[PDB]
Amino acid sequence: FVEMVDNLRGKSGQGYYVEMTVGSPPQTLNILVDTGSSNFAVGAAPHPFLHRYYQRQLSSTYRDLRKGVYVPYTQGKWEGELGTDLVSIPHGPNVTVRANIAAITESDKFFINGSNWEGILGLAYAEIARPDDSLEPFFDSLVKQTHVPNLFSLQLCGAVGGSMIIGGIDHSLYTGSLWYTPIRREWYYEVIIVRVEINGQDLKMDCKEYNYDKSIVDSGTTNLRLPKKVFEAAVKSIKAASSTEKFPDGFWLGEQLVCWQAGTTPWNIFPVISLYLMGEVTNQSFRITILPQQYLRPVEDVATSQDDCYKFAISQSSTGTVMGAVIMEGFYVVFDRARKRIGFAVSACHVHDEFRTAAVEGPFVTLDMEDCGYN
Ligand SMILES: CC(C)c1cccc(CNC[C@@H](O)[C@@H]2COC/C=C/C[C@@H](c3ccccc3)NC(=O)c3cc(cc(N(C)S(C)(=O)=O)c3)C(=O)N2)c1
Numbered sequence: 001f002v003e004m005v006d007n008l009r010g011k012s013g014q015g016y017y018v019e020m021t022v023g024s025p026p027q028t029l030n031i032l033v034d035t036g037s038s039n040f041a042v043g044a045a046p047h048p049f050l051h052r053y054y055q056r057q058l059s060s061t062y063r064d065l066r067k068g069v070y071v072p073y074t075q076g077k078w079e080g081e082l083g084t085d086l087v088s089i090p091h092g093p094n095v096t097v098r099a100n101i102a103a104i105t106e107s108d109k110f111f112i113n114g115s116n117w118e119g120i121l122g123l124a125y126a127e128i129a130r131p132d133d134s135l136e137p138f139f140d141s142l143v144k145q146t147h148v149p150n151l152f153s154l155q156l157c158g159a160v161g162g163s164m165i166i167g168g169i170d171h172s173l174y175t176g177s178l179w180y181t182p183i184r185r186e187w188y189y190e191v192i193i194v195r196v197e198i199n200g201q202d203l204k205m206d207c208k209e210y211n212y213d214k215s216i217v218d219s220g221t222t223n224l225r226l227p228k229k230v231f232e233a234a235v236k237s238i239k240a241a242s243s244t245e246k247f248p249d250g251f252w253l254g255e256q257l258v259c260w261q262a263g264t265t266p267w268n269i270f271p272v273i274s275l276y277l278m279g280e281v282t283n284q285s286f287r288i289t290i291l292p293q294q295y296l297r298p299v300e301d302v303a304t305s306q307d308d309c310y311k312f313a314i315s316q317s318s319t320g321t322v323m324g325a326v327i328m329e330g331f332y333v334v335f336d337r338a339r340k341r342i343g344f345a346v347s348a349c350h351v352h353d354e355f356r357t358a359a360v361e362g363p364f365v366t367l368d369m370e371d372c373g374y375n
Pocket residue numbers: 012013014015032034036037038071072073074075076112120128129218220221222223224225315324
């Protein structure tokens with residue numbers, strides 16, 4: 001797995017990407033790793049923000065599937081033409097497999113000026129593939145075509161880099177225990193949140209609320225996104241904990257940055273946030289704790305660089321909870337498809353400071369026998 005270590009790069013909340021090749025002869029593209037969707041898609045026509053794109057006419061292994069496809073995410077949108085071709089991951093397992101590829105020919109607010117990636121690897125299940133669930137996702141083809149075990153793990157670092165280990169778990173990438181929460185249903189990587197605390201204080205809502213109307217693990221979304229009711233309760237609590245300083249409403253909404261004299265950020269006025277995930281046994285849970293160094297994301301800009309400036313990276317959602325890269329960075333996350341479970345452990349690349357450390361820990365029990373799944 002050592003060959004696979006540090007095979008991810010990124011630009012800081014611009015997304016983590018892995019090098020892949022498509023076509024014969026191999027065309028090199030950087031591909032965003034997305035556990036929040038299930039299409040493999042690449043830029044296939046010129047675009048002002050693409051340094052390079054897939055040229056189907058140059059690949060003798062390309063087969064056209066005579067079917068278009070359109071994919072709108074929460075933000076960003078592309079459309080294109082389906083086909084298959086040979087795909088490999090130079091710093092992944094040593095194999096080449098044939099896979100579906102959407103060749104993107106038009107898009108909106110999807111590619112980013114200077115991002116370095118030219119396509120997207122949807123690693124979730126066929127149930128949410130477009131145009132429908134008969135379009136086998138990349139990781140399904142990989143496992144069917146090779147002897148790779150049905151598991152991958154992500155260590156997203158930033159603050160960027162990281163590792164996606166295909167087929168296994170690399171112990172050098174984490175410390176302490178791995179804790180597992182069940183995948184509720186194979187579509188998104190859907191999980192169940194049973195309790196939320198902000199500086200050790202329970203939000204005290206019915207736990208179904210935390211999962212209204214699903215909770216997902218999504219490396220393709222930057223923020224921790226929360227159902228409105230949870231988001232409003234979370235912000236109330238963070239504000240109360242951090243009340244020695246008062247920030248504008250635009251800060252709370254992600255529309256404005258807050259800035260401090262370089263090196264003087266008052267991390268200790270901001271609370272730790274704990275998400276307790278359903279465990280593998282009845283009414284047991286574990287918690288993952290995040291520090292303000294994860295949920296206050298630095299915005300790099302030479303122009304404001306006398307300061308450190310941050311965006312609040314918790315935001316509201318009308319489509320359920322999204323545990324985005326805010327939650328994943330500094331955890332080693334194991335997508336154990338074979339055992340229908342997702343493991344979390346503290347990563348070798350945790351942020352911590354001299355006072356507080358992100359954690360994955362348990363077990364915790366609750367007598368209340370309510371199931372937290374929203375039907
Ligand atoms: C089943 C499919 C069709 C579907 C449909 C609807 C929702 C989903 C759930 N998964 C979404 C994921 O798949 C795509 C993937 O997008 C990858 C792009 C990353 C670029 C990055 C970025 C943009 C601009 C500057 C820096 C980074 N975007 C976000 O962080 C980025 C990306 C996305 C959402 C956000 N949020 C809205 S946010 C502002 O963090 O709250 C942020 C997003 O939609 N990501 C899935």
